[PDB]
């Protein structure tokens, strides 16, 4: 109810759409669940952790949007030509809770390919972690307020934002002063990461502001259009890069599977 799901009838085309993306979006993260699964005995050990990391985020977020395919469709039926709320079992903030866990994961992943060790490695995983839950909690008390009180929205949503810029000058700092020790060339693609990364985080709170400017069945649509733009770019296409990157250090580490997987 405090979200603005519950305040609209949905056409059908709107209505499957959604169920396509949100079931789209299951099969995306189970394929490359098994990809990441295969391919994590060509990278040494050193770095397979990432690889692993990557395993739980597909079925992580999997999981999620699949429990939130079928409360869709538990939560609506079609009568007299639209899609109406039968049942209040539908709600983004699945999502958020879920981030508490997926988020640190794409952040160890990165720090490990970085060649982060000991003291440092926990000590930067740390406060990554610390920003990351504050913005997401200060996140997800602000949608609570999508319907009932925009401002709040905001000023919640100012906070988070602070938090992710402190979390990114972390991330960005760490990547510049360290990508002289990365291997196979990879100190080239790891800056590609950092700007995927940029680019698909902040797709998030792109979506998080569509209440305040389209409050309408649409924006609905449109929000999850853009959560699952953003979900398969910052899981699936960047595992991927992380995952190139483990394996071509590993080769240039000297590790054999790597060297014939490559
Ligand atoms: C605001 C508080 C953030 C300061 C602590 C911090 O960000 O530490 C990052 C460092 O680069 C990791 O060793
Ligand atoms: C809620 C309102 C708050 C508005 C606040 C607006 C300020 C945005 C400016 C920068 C964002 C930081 C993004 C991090 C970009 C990477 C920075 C970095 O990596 O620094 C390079 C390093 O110094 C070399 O070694
Ligand atoms: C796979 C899911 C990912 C990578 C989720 C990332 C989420 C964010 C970067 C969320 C950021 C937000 C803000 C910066 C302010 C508005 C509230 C959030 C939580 C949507
Ligand atoms: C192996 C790689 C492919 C993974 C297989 C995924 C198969 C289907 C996922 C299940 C999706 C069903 C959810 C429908 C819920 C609903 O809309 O009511
Ligand atoms: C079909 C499901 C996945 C097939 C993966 C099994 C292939 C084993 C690869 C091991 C190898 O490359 O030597
Ligand atoms: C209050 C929340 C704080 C959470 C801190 C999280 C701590 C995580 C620290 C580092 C995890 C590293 C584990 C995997 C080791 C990889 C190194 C390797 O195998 O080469
Ligand atoms: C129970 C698992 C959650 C772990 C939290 C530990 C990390 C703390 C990070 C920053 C906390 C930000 C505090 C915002 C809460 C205020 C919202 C409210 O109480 O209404
Ligand atoms: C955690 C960091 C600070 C949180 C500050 C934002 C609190 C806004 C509360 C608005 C209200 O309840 O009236
Ligand atoms: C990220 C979110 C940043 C929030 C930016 C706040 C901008 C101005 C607030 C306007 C207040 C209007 C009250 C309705
Ligand atoms: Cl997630």
């Known amino acids: 109810m405090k979200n603005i799901e519950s305040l609209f009838d949905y056409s059908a085309g709107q209505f499957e759409f959604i169920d396509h993306l949100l079931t789209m979006g299951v099969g995306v993260h189970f394929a490359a669940l098994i990809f990441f699964l295969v391919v994590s005995q ?3 050990p050193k770095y397979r952790i990432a690889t692993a990391l990557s ?20 939560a609506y039926a079609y009568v007299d030509g639209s899609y109406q709320l039968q049942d209040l079992t539908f709600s983004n903030g699945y999502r958020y809770v879920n981030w508490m866990a997926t988020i640190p994961c794409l952040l160890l992943q ?8 000991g003291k440092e490695l926990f000590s930067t995983a740390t406060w990554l972690i610390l920003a990351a839950w504050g913005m997401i909690i200060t996140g997800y008390v602000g949608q609570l307020y999508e319907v009932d009180d925009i401002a709040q929205l905001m000023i919640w949503g100012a906070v988070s934002t602070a938090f992710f810029v402190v979390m990114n000058w972390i991330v960005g700092t760490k990547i510049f002063k360290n990508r002289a020790t990365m291997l196979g060339g990879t100190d080239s693609t790891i800056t590609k990461v950092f700007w995927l990364m940029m680019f698909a985080w902040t797709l998030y709170p792109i979506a998080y502001l569509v209440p305040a400017f389209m409050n309408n069945a649409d924006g609905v649509v449109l929000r999850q259009l853009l959560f699952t733009i953003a979900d398969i770019s910052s899981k699936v296409i960047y595992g991927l890069m992380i995952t190139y990157i483990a394996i071509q250090q590993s080769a240039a580490a000297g590790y054999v599977p790597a060297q014939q997987a490559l």
């Open 42 to 44: 060509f990278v040494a």
């Open 55 to 74: 395993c739980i985020v597909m079925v992580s977020a999997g999981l999620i949007l699949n429990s939130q395919a079928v409360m869709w469709t538990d």
């Open 110 to 117: 990165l720090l490990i390919v970085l060649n982060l060790k």
